């Protein structure tokens, strides 16, 4: 059963997420407008969306129980390596299997494979990303499991450059145990069948997506002309 501490963790993570993820997507109006027709016509809008989302992921991360006990340098390394992954995970909330797209409240803010390819990426990465979203959606995670997964993804002890890897592991373990116990107590079968193992598998899938993303980002941001379309935060976090 869920200890009081574990119920505490879930309460905090649910709240941290509610304060960093606006389901009405009201702020999208502040982003450079999307252009759908210039093989990079969607880059300004999506780069802004990503930059905005990186900020939200950071705000979420700071509220993770135990994250505070980490050093500044370890916090930076965890966020720099997990950002794109948490953005992919958090995006599952707007992803819809109806037409394989991310529905953010309006046709203008509804993205599909065509839109993403107009941000400077190829199917080498987009197809796997869509496949990832569909598999994750089919897990019908409870919001509780969704927030714990994102937290577990952020506090990963094996990210390169990590110093106090054991502290990072201790912090992660506490989240994992909360998750495993939560599934056993609050998630009814059959939906709970190997659900933990399947969630950890998505993290593995994210490592592959992260890897391919780093390669394509290098390519895209290779020409100063395109890196010029990004934001200062996106450049600092993803590199260059």
């Amino acid at each position: 059963k869920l200890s009081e501490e574990q119920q505490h963790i879930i309460a905090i993570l649910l709240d941290a997420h509610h304060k960093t993820y606006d389901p009405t997507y009201a702020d999208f109006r502040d982003f450079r407008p999307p252009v759908r027709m210039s093989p990079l016509s969607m880059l300004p809008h999506l780069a802004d969306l990503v930059s905005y989302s990186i900020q939200k992921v950071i705000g979420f991360a700071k509220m993770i129980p135990g994250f505070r006990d980490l050093t500044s340098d370890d916090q930076i390394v965890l966020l720099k390596s997990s950002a794109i992954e948490v953005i992919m995970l958090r995006s599952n909330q707007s992803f819809t299997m109806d037409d394989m797209s991310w529905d953010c409240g309006s046709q203008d803010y509804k993205y599909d494979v065509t839109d993403v390819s107009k941000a400077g990426h190829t199917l080498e990465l987009i197809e796997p990303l869509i496949k990832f979203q569909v598999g994750l959606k089919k897990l019908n995670l409870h919001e509780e499991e969704h927030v714990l997964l994102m937290a577990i993804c952020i506090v990963s002890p094996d990210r390169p450059g990590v110093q106090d890897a054991k502290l990072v592991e201790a912090i992660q373990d506490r989240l994992s145990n909360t998750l495993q116990t939560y599934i056993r107590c609050r998630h009814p079968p059959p939906g709970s069948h190997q659900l933990y193992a399947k969630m950890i598998q998505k993290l593995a899938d994210l490592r592959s997506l992260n890897e391919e993303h780093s390669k394509q980002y290098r390519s895209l941001s290779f020409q100063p002309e395109n890196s010029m379309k990004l934001t200062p935060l996106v450049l600092e976090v993803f590199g260059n």
């Binding site: 900020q55 950071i58 500044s72 916090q75 930076i76 720099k80 935060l233 600092e236 976090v237």
Partner: peptide
């Protein structure tokens, strides 16, 4: 390796 913006946001 300097991430001033990321650091400022992490607090």
């Amino acid at each position: 390796k300097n991430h001033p913006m990321l650091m400022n946001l992490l607090k």
